[PDB]
């Protein structure tokens, strides 16, 4: 029942070649649905469930507010460079806003910024004030206390996004709820008297997966090294786990893959061999 919404923004000085300087990306449970760039200057859908449940009037209203966000982040790069006293080079302005609907039903809304990959300003709901993490983020707090954006932002993070996220979950209930089975392949490589056994899971959904190596039926979590849950170009995910072994012990090892698509954890060997 844990459903998330996140709108990530990036304003750049050096994109660099061909790439756009401004980019706004939206997410529903970690999946891309909203796309924007400074070259095209249009908020367009990415998933089939969002486009089939929204009109062009919604996307036209979403474009103009992000176009305004583009211009606001354009001057932000120039304003922040004066406070730090910098001529130019590699400078970036990051922003991540959204709300989380927890299992119990508690609303967890976040709104925070960063300059040069370091925490700048973060909004708190319990205090209803914008917290400044860096001494150069103090004039930002002065602008927020004068304007009074605090009440308007709180009614957005607790109501506006929360009401829309409930609809987004219902719009893509068939897409998010769908489970994709992974294609498992068990490999091995010989180097300096050490056999490195590899296990790769191809195109699985959702993102959570536990891929562990086994020796004689017993799990060996410490000896196994994972590469992480890396994403594919179509929306699916990939994972790579390797373990060191004695040459001639390869078949004693088994790859355990426990995913939402599998009712029981899948056990795959090199000679079996793998998923096929």
């Amino acid at each position: 029942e844990l459903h998330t919404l996140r709108y990530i923004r990036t304003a750049m000085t050096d994109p660099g070649p061909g790439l756009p300087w401004f980019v706004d990306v939206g997410y529903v449970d970690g999946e891309l649905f909203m796309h924007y760039n400074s070259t095209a200057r249009r908020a367009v859908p990415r998933t089939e469930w969002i486009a089939a449940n929204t009109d062009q009037q919604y996307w036209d209203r979403e474009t103009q507010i992000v176009q305004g966000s583009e211009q606001i982040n354009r001057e932000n790069l120039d304003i922040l460079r004066r406070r730090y006293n910098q001529t130019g080079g590699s400078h970036t302005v990051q922003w991540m806003s959204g709300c989380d609907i927890l299992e119990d039903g508690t609303i967890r809304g976040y709104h925070q910024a960063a300059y040069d990959g370091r925490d700048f300003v973060a909004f708190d709901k319990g205090t209803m004030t914008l917290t400044a993490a860096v001494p150069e983020a103090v004039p930002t707090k002065r602008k927020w206390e004068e304007g009074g954006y605090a009440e308007g932002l709180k009614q957005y993070l607790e109501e506006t996004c929360v009401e829309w996220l409930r609809r987004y979950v219902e719009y893509g209930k068939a897409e998010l709820g769908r489970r994709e089975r992974p294609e498992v392949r068990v490999w091995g490589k010989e180097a300096d008297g050490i056999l490195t056994l590899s296990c790769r899971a191809h195109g699985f959904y959702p993102r959570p997966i536990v891929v562990s190596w086994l020796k004689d039926g017993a799990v060996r979590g410490q000896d196994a090294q994972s590469g992480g849950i890396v994403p594919n170009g179509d929306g699916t995910y990939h994972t790579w786990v390797t373990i060191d072994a004695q040459p001639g012990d390869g078949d004693k090892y088994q790859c355990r893959v426990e995913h939402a698509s599998l009712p029981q954890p899948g056990l795959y060997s090199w000679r079996s061999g793998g998923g096929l």
Binding site: E62, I65, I79, S97, G152
Partner: peptide, 10 residues
């Protein structure tokens, strides 16, 4: 849905 452009001002 994203709110007002003013919340991104620094």
């Amino acid at each position: 849905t994203a709110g007002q452009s003013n919340y991104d001002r620094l």
